[PDB]
């Protein structure tokens, strides 16, 4: 079908890749499943530590205007708003500023920016404002610069949402809350997209995102030609990881992962949110992935590539020798998470006037 091309570190991540491979090489099957699946904590998502090799939990945090659910930060204008400036300098400085606030709040991975999913097939898209232009060229430019800003600030990006994620209606994220299951109720809207259109319109901004060095990409809730984005082999293994030569990790949207084995085989590298959100949003790896490896269904080396893709960003942005500070706010919310919040003021002179 479409096999999983191994990470090699690409142009800029060469040394980071090699530190990643080295670390992954030392990891037990449990450790591999610990880092490739979400655990419980204060951030939108959290990767399990590899505590024996001193790899810590990574804080994944919303969102594309800056860290969400924190005090002591600034509320930046939306992507829609910078787009309207048609000013590359502002697009970059916006992201750079968002970036320092993410770093200084303690975020390893910013669940941002929005780089062409949604792009704007419908002017009614409920979350269209999070993107930029209704145009691949201009969106590509803003996406490039948005990615660079955040990464220059020392925070790994997760560009979102790959791909063809053009309506909120019946995205139908995976949720098995109460007795009921979305999987029984209704499958996600299937974006059915020819190959010219995928190439010339939707992939264009993501290509720019990859070129800018986005460390990760988030696969979307919709299905493409009736396969989930997060387990679409053509989309992740071929279009993204081969043609766009993407060297980083594919993070599930929160409930965008619907299965265990196809996901592992067809491009997904991180299961989010895992144990977070009471497990309500699916929890298909973790202990399940351990079992699948130990019984020969899934190759350990397949999962080592996932862990390598995750650690590449860690090492490239220097989070190993320059760790972000502790994240201090409960952004999940009680009663889902009963944790107290600290306080940290992260607002810096210059930010208000940039805004």
């Amino acid at each position: 079908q479409w096999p999983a091309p191994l990470a090699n570190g690409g142009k800029s991540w060469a040394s980071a890749f090699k530190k990643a491979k080295a670390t992954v090489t030392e990891m037990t099957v449990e450790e591999l499943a610990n880092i490739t699946s979400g655990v419980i904590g204060l951030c939108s998502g959290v990767t399990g530590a590899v505590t024996r090799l001193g790899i810590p939990e990574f804080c994944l945090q919303d969102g594309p205007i800056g860290p969400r659910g924190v005090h002591g930060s600034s509320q930046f204008p939306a992507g829609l708003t910078v787009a309207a400036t048609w000013d590359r300098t502002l697009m970059y400085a916006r992201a750079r500023g968002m970036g320092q606030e993410f770093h200084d709040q303690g975020v390893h991975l910013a669940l941002a920016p929005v780089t062409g999913g949604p792009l704007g097939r419908t002017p009614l898209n409920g979350r269209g404002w999070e993107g930029t232009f209704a145009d691949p060229y201009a969106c590509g430019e803003a996406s490039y610069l948005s990615v660079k800003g955040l990464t220059d600030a020392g925070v790994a990006t997760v560009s979102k949402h790959w791909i063809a994620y053009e309506q909120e209606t019946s995205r139908n994220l995976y949720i098995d809350i109460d007795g009921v299951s979305q999987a029984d109720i209704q499958l996600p809207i299937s974006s059915n997209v020819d190959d010219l259109t995928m190439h010339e319109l939707y992939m264009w901004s993501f290509a720019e995102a990859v070129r800018a060095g986005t460390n990760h990409i988030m696969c979307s809730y919709n299905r493409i030609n009736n396969t989930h984005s997060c387990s679409n082999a053509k989309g992740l293994n071929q279009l993204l990881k081969t043609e766009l030569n993407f060297q980083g990790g594919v993070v599930s949207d929160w409930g965008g992962q619907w299965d265990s084995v196809p996901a592992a085989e067809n491009g997904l590298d991180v299961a989010m949110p895992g144990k977070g959100f009471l497990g309500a949003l699916g929890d298909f790896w973790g202990a399940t992935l351990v079992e699948l490896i130990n019984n020969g269904t899934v190759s350990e080396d397949l999962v080592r590539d996932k862990a390598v893709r995750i650690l590449t960003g860690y090492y490239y942005l220097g989070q190993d020798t320059n760790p972000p500070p502790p994240f201090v706010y409960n952004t999940i919310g009680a009663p889902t998470l009963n944790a107290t919040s600290g306080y940290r003021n992260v607002r810096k002179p210059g930010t208000a006037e940039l805004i």
């Binding site: 005090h71 002591g72 306080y343 003021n345």
Partner: protein, 401 residues
């Protein structure tokens, strides 16, 4: 603005004022922001808005003694200016807390993490009717109940046309400070915040008595009757406000001429100077008021003597002090004391002293002869008392002409 800053009166302060540089500030009450319909929505007489309308900061009263506003400087906007300077956050719930969906939820969530919570209360009244009691306007009773539930550092600020009932909470340890600021006109917010943040210590004192209860005031204050010829008899006589309170032995909440500072003043060196007299030559028009000691040259308003005292800032901060002088005129059924002088010292440095001076005119020490139909100076022992309020008078002397 300077009128607002000189007027606003500090009734309670357990340690929370002045503010240093709080990082998380919570604000409660539509009094903190604009009239939702506009500052002049209520019309030519500030009385045409609906009874439940959120009128915003109470800057003037209702009726013929109101006036239009070019703008209102809301407490919130002024508090915000200051928060931004301190690189802090500030959030206000300004809806009706009882009737607005989620208001109560919002307050419950906002307040526990605030370093300080302001609650702005108001009590509108007007020409054409009397207040039916000491009742807070709109949702103020509710605001206060919620505020003390979720915060241990409530600072209450009252915009009112008169005394209001705050008995429920005034002794709540969670209410760390209480201020009234009356009707401050357009510069409402920027007159107040300097005081709160301690740029200028509060210097204003109550121009009437704050009784614990409407039942402690002159009986039959308002008479209600359908009677074709309604009747109020002033059987209390000269005994209104603190005169009544003083004679009946009633402790109020906050006495006439009371108001705290951010520093303390020690009174000393009482002096009555019989040689410091002068003839009234300045007043524009003269009365034909009759009096005993008249001799065709002199006046009721000649200053007969003059009295002096010394205040010393014994605190830790600069502050202004309104010195009061009261006199006990002897006679039968004569008030326990009557205010016959005040002198406000401006911005007295720590450790520094200043002399307070009070010109006592003749009329200031006279009674009306009901029988002889003239003003006359009684004989007896006149008490002279000087101090900070109508019940804080550390210096007395006696005079007998």
């Amino acid at each position: 603005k300077e009128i607002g800053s000189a007027s606003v009166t500090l009734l309670k302060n357990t340690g929370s004022l002045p503010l240093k540089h709080p990082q998380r500030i919570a604000v409660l009450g539509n009094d903190a922001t604009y009239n939702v319909l506009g500052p002049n929505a209520c019309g030519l007489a500030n009385s045409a808005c609906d009874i439940d309308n959120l009128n915003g900061t109470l800057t003037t009263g209702g009726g013929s003694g109101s006036a239009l506003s070019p703008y209102t400087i809301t407490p919130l906007e002024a508090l915000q200016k200051r928060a931004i300077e301190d690189n802090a956050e500030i959030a206000a719930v300004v809806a009706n807390s009882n009737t607005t969906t989620g208001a109560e939820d919002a307050i419950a969530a906002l307040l526990p993490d605030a370093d300080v919570t302001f609650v702005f209360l108001n009590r509108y009244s007007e020409e054409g009717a009397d207040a039916p009691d000491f009742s807070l306007g709109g949702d103020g009773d509710n605001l206060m109940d919620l505020a003390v539930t979720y915060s241990s550092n409530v600072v209450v600020v009252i915009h009112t046309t008169g005394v209001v009932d705050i008995e429920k909470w005034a002794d709540n340890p969670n209410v760390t400070a209480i201020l009234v600021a009356y009707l401050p006109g357009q510069e409402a917010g920027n007159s107040l915040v300097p005081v709160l943040y301690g740029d200028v210590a509060p210097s204003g004192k109550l121009p009437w008595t704050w009784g614990k209860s409407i039942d402690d005031y002159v009986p039959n204050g308002v008479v209600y009757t359908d009677a074709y010829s309604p009747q109020s008899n002033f059987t209390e006589g000269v005994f209104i406000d603190y005169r009544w309170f003083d004679k009946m032995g009633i402790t109020p909440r906050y006495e006439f001429g009371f108001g705290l500072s951010y520093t303390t003043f020690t009174y000393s060196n009482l002096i009555v100077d019989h040689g410091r007299w002068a003839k009234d030559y300045s007043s524009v028009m003269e009365t034909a008021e009759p009096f005993a000691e008249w001799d065709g040259t002199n006046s009721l308003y000649d200053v007969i003597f003059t009295v002096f005292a010394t205040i010393t800032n014994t605190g830790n901060l600069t502050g202004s002090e309104v010195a009061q002088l009261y006199i006990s005129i002897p006679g039968d059924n004569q008030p326990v004391r009557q205010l016959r002088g005040f002198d406000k010292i401006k911005d007295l440095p720590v450790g520094d002293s200043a002399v307070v001076t009070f010109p006592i005119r003749r009329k200031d020490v006279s009674s009306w002869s009901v029988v002889d139909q003239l003003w006359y100076v009684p004989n007896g022992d006149f008490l002279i008392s000087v101090g900070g309020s109508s019940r804080d008078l550390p210096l007395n002397t006696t005079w007998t002409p």
